[PDB]
Each structure stands twice: as C-alpha cells, then as structure tokens.
Amino acid sequence: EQLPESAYMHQLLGLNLLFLLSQNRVAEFHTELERLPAKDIQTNVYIKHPVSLEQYLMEGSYNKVFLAKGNIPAESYTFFIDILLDTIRDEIAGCIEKAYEKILFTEATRILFFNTPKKMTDYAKKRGWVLGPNNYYSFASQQQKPEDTTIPSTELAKQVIEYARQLEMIV
Amino acid sequence: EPPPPPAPQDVEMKEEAATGGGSTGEADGKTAAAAAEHSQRELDTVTLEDIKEHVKQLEKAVSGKEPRFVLRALRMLPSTSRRLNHYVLYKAVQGFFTSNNATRDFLLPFLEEPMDTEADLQFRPRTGKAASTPLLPEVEAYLQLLVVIFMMNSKRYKEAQKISDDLMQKISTQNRRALDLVAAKCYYYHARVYEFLDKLDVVRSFLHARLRTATLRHDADGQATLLNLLLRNYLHYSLYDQAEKLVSKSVFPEQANNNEWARYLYYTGRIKAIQLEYSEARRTMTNALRKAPQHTAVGFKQTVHKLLIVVELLLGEIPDRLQFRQPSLKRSLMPYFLLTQAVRTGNLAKFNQVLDQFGEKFQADGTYTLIIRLRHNVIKTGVRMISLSYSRISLADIAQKLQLDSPEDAEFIVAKAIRDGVIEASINHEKGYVQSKEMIDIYSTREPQLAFHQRISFCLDIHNMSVKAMRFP
Amino acid sequence: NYNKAVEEEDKMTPEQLAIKNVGKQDPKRHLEEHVDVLMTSNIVQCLAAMLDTVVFK
Amino acid sequence: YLSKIEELQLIVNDKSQNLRRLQAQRNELNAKVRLL
Amino acid sequence: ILDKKFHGILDQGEGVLIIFDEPPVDKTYEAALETIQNMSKVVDSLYNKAKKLT
Amino acid sequence: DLYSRYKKLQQELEFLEVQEEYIKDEQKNLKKEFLHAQEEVKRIQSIPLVIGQFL
Amino acid sequence: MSEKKQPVDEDNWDDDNVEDDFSNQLRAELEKHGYKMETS
Amino acid sequence: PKNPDLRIAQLRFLLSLPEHRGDAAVRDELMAAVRDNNMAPYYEALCKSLDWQIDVDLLNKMKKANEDELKRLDEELEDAEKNLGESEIRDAMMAKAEYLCRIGDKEGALTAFRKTYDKTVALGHRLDIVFYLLRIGLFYMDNDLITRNTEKAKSLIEEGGDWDRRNRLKVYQGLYCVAIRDFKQAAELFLDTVSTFTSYELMDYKTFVTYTVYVSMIALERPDLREKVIKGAEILEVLHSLPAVRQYLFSLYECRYSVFFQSLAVVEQEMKKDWLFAPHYRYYVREMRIHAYSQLLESYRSLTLGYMAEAFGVGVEFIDQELSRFIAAGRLHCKIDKVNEIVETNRPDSKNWQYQETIKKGDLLLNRVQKLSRVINM
C-alpha cells in the first residue's frame, strides 16, 4: 500500500464502478463495495453520487438520470451513462409495453425523448406491435390461458418409475 | 499449596495413559478409518484443557511437566512405559526436589528433544501432542511478545510432524486422519499466532498446498477444515477467493462433525449474503442456525444468529425475533430488536434514527450493504403490507399516503413489484387510476400436487438417509 | 380406514419405550401393512390414474 | 510411488467391507424369521 | 345466515344462492390428528436419542 | 515388498464385491419365500370355523 | 469443537407478537373508537 | 386471614392505574394501615407511595403491637416446646406466623412454608401455603411465587380428588393462565361454577361469575357459546344480578353493529379495573372485535363497508384502518376494497389451508431429528 498518491486515485474507482454497474454485474458491484469498503462513503463524491445513483435505480429510476448527467464536472462518466441509457432504453422496451394495458403518445413522448425519432418508433415496432394514431395499446398478450393438459400426469409417473427403483435398490 | 499437587497428577495421567496406550491399540488395530476412540476423546479433553489447568498453568511451584515428558521422548520396549511412570513419580519436583522451571527458556532444546531422543516408533500423535500442547495452551498467556515465533516454532515441529506424516510411513498410517484433526486445530493456532499481528503468508500457499496434500489421496476431514480456513480468513482479508472456489467447488463425501458442517454452511451462507442470492441462503443459514445448538453461555449462537438474519430481514419478510432474545444480547443490542420493530412499521424517521444513531453498532455490523436497499425494503414492506391488505387500491391512496409526491413514482414501485411478481396490479394510464386487482384460483387444483414432488422427494431422500444410517453398524 | 385405525395403536407404544434395556418387555413391530399395503395401494391406483393417458393416447 | 499408494487407497476399501459384513448380517436377518 | 346456517352462502347474481358442500374430507383430518401426536412421539423419543449418546 | 500387497487385497476386494452383489438378491428372494409363507399362514382360515370359547 | 471464529467476535416474551400491534399502533384505541359515538 | 390483605393487594392495584393522584393512595392507605397489625401494607407502600411524616404515635404503636405479638410468640412456642403432640410449635405458630407474613415481609417463607411443610402429610396446610404464595403473588404481582405454589401443589395433585379446594386450584391456575395471554384453560377450569360456593379465599362469588363469563365469552365457539352462556341453568341468576353483563352477552349474541360497541364500551370500562388483567386490556378488546367480525363476515359475500358504517356508528374512515390492521395482522381473511367496495370472504379451511402444517412440522421437528440423524460418524 506504501505508494505515492495520484490525483485520479478514487475517481478511477468511480469510473470502474460506473462501467461495472452499466455492464449489469452485481457481484462485481458488491466486490466493488467490498474491495475497499470503508473509504467509499465520505470521500470521492464520484463514488457516493454513483452509489446513491444505484439507490435511485433501486427506488425511483427514470427520474434522476438526466438530473445526474447534469452533475458530472469530470467528463468521463457520461460515456458510461450512455451505456446506462442503453440499459434504460432496453428496459423501456421491456417495461412500458407488453406488461401494461395501453399508454397514449405523450407518455412515450416524455419518457422516450426527441418526441418522434426512428428510435421510439424502433421501440414501438420492437415490441412486435403496430401503433395507431395517438395511442400505444399493449394488447394481444398472454394467449389461450395455457395449462399443460396432462403431461405432468405422465412424466411424474415417470418419476414414480425411479421411485419404484428406490423401492428396488433397497432389498 | 498442598491442593495443587494432586489434581494435575490425576487428570494429566488419565489424559496420556488413555491417549498413548489406546493410540497404540488404535494403530495396531491394523485398519481403522473411523474408530479413533482416544483421538476424539483427547480432543474432547484438550478443548477441556483450554478450560482446565493446562500442561502447567504455572501452577504455583515451578510448572514442571515441560521439563518432564519430552525428555527421553522415546517409546522403546515397554520399559519406556516405566519411563512415563518415572514421569509420574517425578511430578513432585515441585514439592519434593529442587524446582526447575524450563518454560519459554529451555523449551527450544525441548522442542529439539523429540528428535534428540531416538527413532519414533510410528506413534506421531504423542509427538503431535508434544508439538501442540506445550505452547498452544500458552496462547492463553495472551502476551504474544517474542513467544509468537516460539509458538510458531512449536508449529514448525508440527511441520516436522507433517514431514514424518506424509513423508514417512508409506503404508497406510491412518493416524494421518488423526493428525489432520490435530493439524487443523493447530492451523487455527497458526491463526491465533499470525492473525494477532500478521497474515499467514506461509499458510496462504501452504493452505493451498495442504489442500494439495489432502485433496484426494488422503483427504478426510482435512478438506473442510482447510476450507473453513479458506472461507474464514478470506473474509476479512478480501474476496473473490469465494469466486476462486467457483470453478473447483468440492465438498466432503460424507458430512463431518455436526458443529463443523453447521459452521461451514454458516460461512458459505454468509458469503451468499454479500452475493445477494437470497434463495439458497435462507435454508442453508436456517440449517446452520438450528444445527449448532451448543455454545458458551456468553453467547456465540446469538452471534451466529445476529450476523445471520440480516439478509433474512433483507428478504422482504422475516419472522419476529421473539424466539431469540437473550438478556446479555439485550444489553449488547447485537441484531437490534428495534430494527426489526421498524421493519414491521412503515416508519422512516425512527428507522433512519436507528441508522444514524446506531452507526456505532453498524461498525460491529460491517454489512453496510443492508441499508441502501433496506430503506428500499422499508418502502417495499409498506407497499407489500398495503397491497396485501387491500383488494383494489389506487395511486391516489398509496402514492401520497406513503408521500411518494406523485403517481408515477408509485407506478415505478408497483412496476418493480410486478417485476418481482408480488402484486398482480394494473395501471389505468388514462385518468390516473391504479386499477389494481387480484388473481384467482388459489384452490389446490394444480399447485400442491406439484409441490408434493418436493415434499415426497424430501421424504424419500430421508428414507435413503435412514437407509445409509442403517448401513453403518 | 384400514390404515389409520391401526396406525394410532401403532404409535401408542413410544409412550412406553424407555431405557434399562431388558427392564421393559413388549417389543412388537408396528410398520407392518402400512409400508406395503400403502405401497401396493397407492402405486397401483396412481397407475390407475395413468390408465387414461396410457389407453387414451 | 505409483502402486505404493494405490494399494493404500485400496486398503481404505476395507471400510467398504464393513458395509458388506452389514449386508451379510441383513441376509442373516430374516433367515431365522423364514426358518420360524 | 349470520347466526345460524344451512350452508346458505350469499350470491347476489346467481338466483339459487348456491348451497353446495363436501362433508367427508376426514382422510386429511385423521392423518393430521395422527401427525399431531406423532411429532410428540418423536419429541418423547428425542430424550432417549440425546441421552444415550452423551 | 509392495507388489504382493495389491495382489492379495485387490482379489479380496473383487471377491467381496462379488458376494456384496449376491447377498442383495439373496435378501430379495427371501421376501418372496416369506410371501409364500404368508399365504400359507392366511389359508388356515377360509371355508370352516368351529366356534368355541376361551377357557 | 465449539468456537473456531466466535470467541474473538409467562412473561411478555410471547405477548411481543400482538405487542408489535400495541406499540406502533392503537394506544389511544377507545379514546377514538369510544368517541365515535359523538364525534360523528 | 386471606381476603382483608388480599383486598389491600387489590388496593395495591388501586395504586397501580391511578398514578397521578397521591390522595386516593393515602386515604385507604391509612385505613388499611391502621387495621389489624399490618406492617408490610404500609412498608412496601412506604417503599412505593408517599413516605411518613412520623410514625411514633402513628404506626410505632402498631410496631409496639407487633412487639406484643412477638413476645406472645416467645410465650407460645416456648410453651409448645414442652408439649409433644402434633408438632404443637409449628402448628400453633404457623397460625401466628402466616399472621406474621400478613404483618411483615416474605419471612413468612421460613416461618410458614417449610415450618408446616416439614411436618405434615395433609394437603390442607400445604394448600394454605399455596394460597399464601398466591396472595403474595398478588402483593408483589409475582411471576415467581404464583408458579412456585404450583410447583409445591403438584407434589400433592398426584394423589387427590377433593370437592371445593381442588376446583379452587383449578381457579387460580386459570388466573395464572389469564394473568398473561393464556385464555382457554382458565374458562374450561372455571366452567364448573357449582362447587366453588364460598371459601375464605373468595371475593364476591358473583364477581367470580363475572370473571368466568368474561373469560368464557371467547375461547368458546358459537354452539358451545350458546349452550354455556345461553342454555346455562344456574348461571342465569348470577348474571341476572348485573344487567349489563346479560346485556353484554345478548348484545354480542344479537350480532348487531352499534350495540357491539355500546356493549364493548361497557366491557371497556370494566376491563382495566381488573388486577392482573388491566395490563392486558388491549388484545381482549380486539379479541372481542375479531370474534364479532369473524362471525359477521363469513356469511355475506356481497358486502359493502357502507352497510357496516350505516349501523356501526361511523366507519367511513373509522373502521378502515381498523379492519385493515385486522386483516393484515394475520387473521380475519377477507378483502378490503377501493370504492368498488365489495368485501370478499374465504374458505372454511376444509380443503386448502389445511394442506400446510404437515410439511410445516415435517420440516422443523423432523429436521431437528435430521440433525440427530447426521450424528452418526463424527
């Protein structure tokens, strides 16, 4: 540990944290909060603003992302919260349609910015769904009321087969 | 001064009479991988020596067993049993004769004496005891100044016993397992010698190399004693060594001592606590909790429970700790009954007062990953309590009753709840309704008959455990 | 009926189990006709529940 | 020390033989039941 | 229907106010009553268990 | 002196695996003879009975 | 065999269950439900 | 020899709930402390309530009466050490020595408990001792001695059968039960109200009737409820004395909505004024509530809370949090709704909820013996 001190000594851990959080590795997230635990709380606001930003991803995401981009004076974190914007947009693409009933065009205009790219059009067609005017239904899902008719009745008797083998292996 | 000459003459002779004279029968009972009836008995009396009146607890004359039993440490034709009887009659150097103390000064040539006396006739647990029991019951002097390397030298003569163990007797010693048991405890004395001041930089690569010499060829009890070292020292001194396991994870063939297997499952569950895998962890930490019922009255089961149930609080649900409250635990406030009291509430001021006020005890917690999502667990506990209570509720009720300042923040909370599958709600994204609802068919049509394969697989595996139990006598 | 009515008297005797090895005298087994009668019964009638999938497709 | 250790790990299979003596005891069980 | 009973549960939208039930379900009852006492027999064998070893 | 050792104990081990496989089917076939004995017990009371009373 | 890391580191005890409903809640219970007669 | 200073133990309970006053302490404090040589009922209240200006002409004349009682003890046991009979010393001095325990502290232990316990084989004197550990577990409000008298009385429960006093053992074991939240065995052992007619440890037998009906109104399902508290023959008169008790039972069995709470206000007034019951004033009240809502909510299925609040009094938001706590507390399964407002009920545990406790015990207790099963090898 007996080394001289560089100016980037903690915000390198901050950049590592930010890419490590963007890459969707949570075991890497906890070994990031465990490799040098005690010093991450007070110093380096480029740790606390990302770990409280993880808290913001935990309890209230899609509310503080751009407002957190508004506070990085050291422009090396916007490159990786572009990756976090990608994991925002895929979770929009998994979490505003095909889980709800219907949303109108202005909610997609607020959350999906630039108000008509081929990007929110890409997302609306990326659901596998055709839009109408001024609306986004989230219909045509969870078909047939599936049941798996009698196949567990068969295959669990095929499990009773090795249950009889367990009656066999003992005397 | 007349009462402390009878007692060690009694208990120490009943120790080594049984120990040596039965280990002779245990190693001339040509095959014994299980028997070891004085090995574990002497371990039951050495853990009792750590309670009791040591090799000599400087017992008010001279501490004379140390210039006694390692001189002429030579087990010849059975007149050396009479040499040990001379070491019975010579126990009154303290009371009859001139009193010579040779602890900490002449113990180093005494550490040279099992080699300075003639050839070991294949009874190493007497010499393993002579390499452990001199100075490791002197760890309880707690001074650890210039005797750190002395206790380490006693373990160097233990390493001489490893030389004579797995570099000598090349036909099936089978006290190799008894010396695994002894060497494990003295590896925890390596812990108690280095880890008071350093780390075990010998026994880092020698932890891996002692795993190497006890991997497959003569591996019995050594694997998870060394793995408890591997999974215990590699918690404070850092992690990803648990991820160094993850391509060579190997456990015992048969489960070992119940306390051992219990605390091993406790270590791996506490590692899965920081891994935030909550499914295997709850059952293995429950197994570890109920599987170690024997502890000192100062506690240590409330220690294991304290550092156990924190992620069980982090589950989103946990029973009340009204079955674990101890009065010394009440004074030491180790798992904070107030914390799980605030878990049952949807309170924020008192919960963060526990946090800010009790960061001094969060020092002893050291598991600050609890809070940054345990506040999330508080708000999830609130929405779980409310949504479990109500059939249909709207955002106008809960989104401002729990002061989320907006409908859409509670919409995101319910979105993560449906992402967790907790509630079966729906949001009317037109007027500002949570048009929530509940699913149907809670009857026993399809679900319990499929859970009965877990139930009856449990049952038949306990049948087969009963069968394997039947297989031993 | 034939199982449970015999099972309560099958479980009576651990009231009277004790120590002082020969100082107690009533060793009788109790597992009889509740292993095997239940084995044959439930396995043949779950194969009877399999008859519909065996005959029908 | 090739077979100098193979034979030792097959000396460990004497503890496999106690299971066999147990099985021989199992077959000796119910032998007097059938002879009764 | 409150105080007394004929298994007359209320439905506001059937007409028949359907009274249907299955009284013999003693298959699970008597087995549950067995397991209640069998756990006690296991507890009362646990003394022999924990005492005869050590 | 080593080569004599696994020339005894390996043969011991494979002889013991031989009889360890055999005794399982032994104890199996004993239960079939036991079921024949059960039917021999059960057929002692079918068509008659001659009521007395225990004295 | 008991230690290995750890030496370094009827009453109201059953009433605690509904007392968890008595401490955070309902301490002025019939001081409001008893006043439901005349508050409205 | 029991009931006066037991009533002063009820005066200790009078010291319990009104705390802000120091006048209702001192008035019948002096009234109970000038009567019948009672050093301890003002000695512990000297340790708890207001102290003494003096005691010289006030209460040292009663320590002088204690001196007179003590010097006639020194007369009596020295006159009984000459006599060689039915342990004349310990008998004719256990009288005055249980009276000494009435005078002073727990030295009644050494001069009563073993002083008659080391001689007799009859349960009368030992049971007087059990009753005195009961009265001193009413003095100190013990958890210890009201279990230690059970520990002493079960030494002669093992051979018995007696008409009133063993039923009184049942009574005070039930009072030990429902001194904490232990509720059904109290009522079940009180239920034989006939043979408990009058003994000199009773208070008002009518108040014994009130206590057994307060404990037997719950832990008694509706057929047993109607058969005991309605079809009870001799109970009807001793609840025809107090109107509000019979009114309470017929308002509960009437199953209205507001006379629930009128009745419940009466038993709210009643439940407090009750020693080793008043610290348990809460779960009894919501226990009455949970019995009431349970018998009222299984029958309907198209239920609105407007139909509740139209006749409970006010419940428009008043029973809202009440029923919500009652549901989410673990019990009383129905569904509370948004303004759709349909309360939806559940199953009688005939099929579904029954299917759990089997594996709930075959996990836990059978897993303890899984641990003991894994005690084979090492």
PDB file of C-alpha atoms in Angstrom, chain B residues 34 40 181 221 254-258 261 287 289-293 301 344 385 387-394 396-397 434 438 442-445 448 452 455 458-459 462 465-466 468-469 472, chain H residues 320-321 323-330 333-340 342 344 346-347 351-352 355-360 362-364 366-378:
ATOM      1  CA  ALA B  34     -13.461 -44.448  11.747  1.00  0.00           C
ATOM      2  CA  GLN B  40     -11.542 -37.546  19.528  1.00  0.00           C
ATOM      3  CA  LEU B 181      -7.629 -33.391  13.103  1.00  0.00           C
ATOM      4  CA  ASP B 221     -11.762 -34.032   7.402  1.00  0.00           C
ATOM      5  CA  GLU B 254     -19.839 -37.591   3.840  1.00  0.00           C
ATOM      6  CA  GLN B 255     -20.877 -34.765   6.140  1.00  0.00           C
ATOM      7  CA  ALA B 256     -18.462 -34.378   9.055  1.00  0.00           C
ATOM      8  CA  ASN B 257     -18.931 -33.308  12.671  1.00  0.00           C
ATOM      9  CA  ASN B 258     -22.271 -31.626  13.152  1.00  0.00           C
ATOM     10  CA  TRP B 261     -20.740 -28.929   8.943  1.00  0.00           C
ATOM     11  CA  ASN B 287     -29.786 -25.285   8.729  1.00  0.00           C
ATOM     12  CA  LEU B 289     -28.782 -21.921  12.878  1.00  0.00           C
ATOM     13  CA  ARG B 290     -30.615 -24.984  14.139  1.00  0.00           C
ATOM     14  CA  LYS B 291     -27.630 -27.281  13.584  1.00  0.00           C
ATOM     15  CA  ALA B 292     -25.344 -25.648  16.196  1.00  0.00           C
ATOM     16  CA  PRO B 293     -27.281 -25.801  19.498  1.00  0.00           C
ATOM     17  CA  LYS B 301     -25.217 -18.612  18.933  1.00  0.00           C
ATOM     18  CA  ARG B 344     -42.844  -4.093  10.764  1.00  0.00           C
ATOM     19  CA  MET B 385     -48.467  -4.561   3.619  1.00  0.00           C
ATOM     20  CA  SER B 387     -51.379  -4.170  -1.302  1.00  0.00           C
ATOM     21  CA  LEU B 388     -51.654  -7.416   0.657  1.00  0.00           C
ATOM     22  CA  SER B 389     -54.315  -5.799   2.836  1.00  0.00           C
ATOM     23  CA  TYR B 390     -56.377  -4.233   0.068  1.00  0.00           C
ATOM     24  CA  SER B 391     -58.066  -5.944  -2.848  1.00  0.00           C
ATOM     25  CA  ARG B 392     -58.113  -2.878  -5.089  1.00  0.00           C
ATOM     26  CA  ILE B 393     -56.248   0.322  -4.231  1.00  0.00           C
ATOM     27  CA  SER B 394     -55.369   3.359  -6.323  1.00  0.00           C
ATOM     28  CA  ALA B 396     -54.460   8.409  -5.095  1.00  0.00           C
ATOM     29  CA  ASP B 397     -54.400   6.426  -1.841  1.00  0.00           C
ATOM     30  CA  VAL B 434     -54.186   2.169 -10.326  1.00  0.00           C
ATOM     31  CA  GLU B 438     -56.068  -9.889  -7.600  1.00  0.00           C
ATOM     32  CA  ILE B 442     -55.970 -20.132  -5.112  1.00  0.00           C
ATOM     33  CA  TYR B 443     -57.528 -23.591  -4.754  1.00  0.00           C
ATOM     34  CA  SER B 444     -55.423 -26.770  -4.632  1.00  0.00           C
ATOM     35  CA  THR B 445     -56.037 -27.808  -8.264  1.00  0.00           C
ATOM     36  CA  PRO B 448     -49.836 -28.554  -4.189  1.00  0.00           C
ATOM     37  CA  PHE B 452     -45.645 -32.750  -3.382  1.00  0.00           C
ATOM     38  CA  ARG B 455     -42.433 -32.910  -0.322  1.00  0.00           C
ATOM     39  CA  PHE B 458     -37.737 -34.728   0.737  1.00  0.00           C
ATOM     40  CA  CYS B 459     -39.426 -37.815   2.227  1.00  0.00           C
ATOM     41  CA  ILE B 462     -34.853 -39.014   4.239  1.00  0.00           C
ATOM     42  CA  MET B 465     -30.644 -41.196   4.722  1.00  0.00           C
ATOM     43  CA  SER B 466     -32.279 -43.662   7.107  1.00  0.00           C
ATOM     44  CA  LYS B 468     -27.439 -45.122   4.819  1.00  0.00           C
ATOM     45  CA  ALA B 469     -27.747 -44.714   8.592  1.00  0.00           C
ATOM     46  CA  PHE B 472     -23.000 -48.352   9.212  1.00  0.00           C
TER      47      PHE B 472
ATOM     48  CA  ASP H 320     -60.956   1.480   7.522  1.00  0.00           C
ATOM     49  CA  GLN H 321     -57.591   1.277   9.292  1.00  0.00           C
ATOM     50  CA  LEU H 323     -60.237  -3.725   9.572  1.00  0.00           C
ATOM     51  CA  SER H 324     -57.029  -3.184   7.577  1.00  0.00           C
ATOM     52  CA  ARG H 325     -54.887  -3.870  10.660  1.00  0.00           C
ATOM     53  CA  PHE H 326     -57.190  -6.775  11.475  1.00  0.00           C
ATOM     54  CA  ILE H 327     -56.729  -8.364   8.041  1.00  0.00           C
ATOM     55  CA  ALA H 328     -53.020  -7.682   7.532  1.00  0.00           C
ATOM     56  CA  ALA H 329     -52.307  -8.649  11.164  1.00  0.00           C
ATOM     57  CA  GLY H 330     -52.504 -12.281  10.006  1.00  0.00           C
ATOM     58  CA  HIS H 333     -59.297 -13.103   5.974  1.00  0.00           C
ATOM     59  CA  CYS H 334     -61.432 -11.005   3.692  1.00  0.00           C
ATOM     60  CA  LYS H 335     -60.666  -8.340   1.091  1.00  0.00           C
ATOM     61  CA  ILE H 336     -60.956  -4.596   1.677  1.00  0.00           C
ATOM     62  CA  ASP H 337     -61.586  -2.639  -1.484  1.00  0.00           C
ATOM     63  CA  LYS H 338     -61.349   0.633  -3.350  1.00  0.00           C
ATOM     64  CA  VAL H 339     -64.701   2.464  -3.917  1.00  0.00           C
ATOM     65  CA  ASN H 340     -65.909  -0.511  -5.957  1.00  0.00           C
ATOM     66  CA  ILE H 342     -67.087  -5.303  -2.299  1.00  0.00           C
ATOM     67  CA  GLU H 344     -64.870 -10.776  -0.385  1.00  0.00           C
ATOM     68  CA  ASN H 346     -62.790 -17.045   2.092  1.00  0.00           C
ATOM     69  CA  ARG H 347     -62.888 -20.846   2.634  1.00  0.00           C
ATOM     70  CA  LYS H 351     -59.595 -28.219   1.697  1.00  0.00           C
ATOM     71  CA  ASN H 352     -56.895 -25.666   1.022  1.00  0.00           C
ATOM     72  CA  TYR H 355     -52.566 -28.550   3.364  1.00  0.00           C
ATOM     73  CA  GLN H 356     -49.658 -26.844   5.098  1.00  0.00           C
ATOM     74  CA  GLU H 357     -48.970 -27.810   8.710  1.00  0.00           C
ATOM     75  CA  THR H 358     -47.937 -31.360   7.815  1.00  0.00           C
ATOM     76  CA  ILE H 359     -44.832 -30.209   5.965  1.00  0.00           C
ATOM     77  CA  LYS H 360     -44.524 -27.281   8.389  1.00  0.00           C
ATOM     78  CA  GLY H 362     -42.040 -32.390   8.931  1.00  0.00           C
ATOM     79  CA  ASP H 363     -39.651 -29.619   8.044  1.00  0.00           C
ATOM     80  CA  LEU H 364     -38.936 -28.238  11.526  1.00  0.00           C
ATOM     81  CA  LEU H 366     -38.169 -33.761  11.633  1.00  0.00           C
ATOM     82  CA  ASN H 367     -35.226 -31.549  10.628  1.00  0.00           C
ATOM     83  CA  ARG H 368     -34.066 -31.440  14.227  1.00  0.00           C
ATOM     84  CA  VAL H 369     -34.023 -35.204  14.035  1.00  0.00           C
ATOM     85  CA  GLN H 370     -32.295 -34.862  10.665  1.00  0.00           C
ATOM     86  CA  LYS H 371     -29.516 -33.195  12.669  1.00  0.00           C
ATOM     87  CA  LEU H 372     -29.548 -36.080  15.144  1.00  0.00           C
ATOM     88  CA  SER H 373     -29.610 -38.431  12.138  1.00  0.00           C
ATOM     89  CA  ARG H 374     -26.460 -36.746  10.903  1.00  0.00           C
ATOM     90  CA  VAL H 375     -24.982 -37.536  14.290  1.00  0.00           C
ATOM     91  CA  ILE H 376     -23.591 -40.913  13.252  1.00  0.00           C
ATOM     92  CA  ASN H 377     -19.968 -40.861  12.202  1.00  0.00           C
ATOM     93  CA  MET H 378     -18.354 -37.692  13.516  1.00  0.00           C
TER      94      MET H 378
END
